[PDB]
């Protein structure tokens, strides 16, 4: 009915309606860091997605 990997997580599932096989991949995730200079100089910032 389904399958796992070395991570012991369900990364492959089979829908019981049809005979196809559907992969399982998580959507976008990760931390965020803000690039900025010293606050005494300027307030301009940059956004970095990890």
């Amino acid at each position: 009915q389904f399958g796992r990997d070395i991570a012991d997580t369900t990364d492959a599932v089979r829908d019981p309606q049809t005979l196809e096989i559907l992969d399982i991949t998580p959507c976008s995730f990760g931390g965020v860091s803000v690039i900025t200079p010293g606050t005494n100089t300027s307030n301009q910032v940059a956004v970095l997605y990890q």
């Binding site: 070395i6 991570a7 012991d8």
Partner: protein, 49 residues
């Protein structure tokens, strides 16, 4: 004792370079530290998984 047998010591150095290039990957246990530090973190991360 270098300018008098420069050709001999040059040939010896080239032979040493060739034999260390041949024996760098002669055994799988030569690069033990890099493989160990790869495994000790990869297996720990996977065990945390």
């Amino acid at each position: 004792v270098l300018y008098e047998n420069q050709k001999l010591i040059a040939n010896q150095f080239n032979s040493a370079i060739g034999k260390i290039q041949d024996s760098l990957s002669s055994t799988p246990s030569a690069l033990g530290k890099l493989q160990d530090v790869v495994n000790h973190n990869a297996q720990a991360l996977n065990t945390l998984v």
